[PDB]
Write a protein that binds this ligand. Structure first.
Ligand SMILES: CCCCCCCCO[C@@H]1O[C@H](CO)[C@@H](O)[C@H](O)[C@H]1O
Length: 344
């Protein structure tokens, strides 16, 4: 039942995998490989020190559950999950396997100029799995071009969980590309929205059009200025940001910025597209368009079909509000790796 494994050291780390995964090849933690069982290129992720603390433990279970759960054409699926371990007691390492696509937004945009019809199809596809993720009450907090895989037939898959949270979860502060990232995150709001992801799409989508990075900061205040240079300084409602009363006075100290007309910035863009961005790049997350409503936006006329824009299933997030020791999280997790059912 248990395949022969084999350990080999890749870049200061050990990697014990079953022998159906050949030619492990680091990308950055991830290797690329070739799966003999099926003959597809895959990506293996070894989780970094799971079960190191009560919070990593929790972190690991959560990720795994989510991946097990995602079953949508525009969201990546778990091909395999495994561990070298032969029982719960030696159990300490976790590997996830997924399909390697061929390309991603990151690199197709460095080298091809995308026409509008391209953009439509791609953004709609992104939006369409966001509608799927957000139905499970999940904010994937790391939308960005390299986490958006595309393949030859131009299908799109959203890629990276781990930073994903359930919505009413006290938000924590984290490591990632600041370019695609909502203001409210950058101000460390303890609570925040699924519309944070809409901000990203907004940014990702303007990059497709123009060829360039919308807001290419170099640190947070540079990031925050670049943003204001476009959407303009906000009104007094602003009291809202108590979350950071040291950040509040640093915005009120900032020079006063007029809101730019998007149609004067995005020359040659479809007016429908520019309209849609104007509804994505508002600093007030209350007035920011949802994935669902955005799917209804006329820009997507050509592709919009509700009945193939499905919602996700009944789940138990129950655990989110549990306090267990490491060893509890450990077992819960182990069981899930055992109970894994692999797609055909
Ligand atoms: C450049 C200055 C940053 C502007 C502040 C961000 C406004 C986002 O919106 C805020 O987000 C919160 C949670 O998502 C909501 O609870 C607030 O009611 C809402 O106003």
């Amino acid at each position: 039942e248990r395949p022969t494994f084999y350990r080999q050291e890749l870049n200061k780390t050990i990697w014990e995998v079953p022998e159906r995964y050949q030619n492990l090849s680091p990308v950055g933690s991830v290797c690329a490989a070739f799966d003999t069982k099926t003959g597809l290129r895959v990506a293996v992720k070894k989780l970094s020190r799971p079960f190191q603390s009560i919070i990593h433990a929790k972190r690991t279970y959560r990720e795994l559950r989510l991946l097990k759960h995602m079953k949508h054409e525009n969201v990546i699926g778990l091909l395999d999950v495994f561990t070298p371990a032969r029982s719960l007691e030696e159990f300490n390492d976790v590997y996830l396997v997924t399909h390697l696509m061929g390309a991603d937004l990151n690199n197709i945009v460095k080298c091809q100029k995308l026409t509008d019809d391209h953009v439509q199809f791609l953004i709609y596809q992104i939006l369409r799995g966001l509608k799927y993720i957000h139905s499970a009450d999940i904010i994937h907090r790391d939308l960005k071009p390299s986490n958006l895989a595309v393949n030859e037939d131009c299908e799109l898959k959203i890629l990276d969980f781990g930073l994903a949270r359930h919505t009413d979860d006290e938000m924590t502060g984290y490591v990632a590309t600041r370019w695609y990232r909502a203001p409210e995150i950058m101000l460390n709001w303890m609570h925040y929205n699924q519309t944070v992801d809409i901000w990203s799409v907004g940014c990702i989508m303007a990059e497709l059009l123009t060829g360039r990075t919308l807001f290419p900061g170099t640190d947070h205040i540079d990031q925050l200025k670049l943003i204001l240079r476009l959407v303009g300084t906000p009104g007094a409602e602003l009291l809202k940001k108590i979350s950071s009363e040291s950040a509040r006075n640093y915005i009120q100290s900032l020079t006063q910025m007029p809101k730019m007309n998007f149609a004067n910035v995005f020359i040659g863009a479809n007016p429908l597209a520019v309209d849609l961005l104007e509804k994505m790049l508002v600093l007030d997350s209350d007035k920011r368009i949802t994935a669902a409503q955005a799917l209804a936006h006329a820009y997507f006329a050509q592709y919009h079909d509700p009945d193939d824009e499905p919602v996700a299933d009944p789940t138990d997030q129950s655990f989110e509000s549990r306090d267990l020791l490491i060893d509890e999280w450990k077992s819960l997790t182990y069981d899930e790796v055992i109970s894994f059912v692999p797609p055909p």
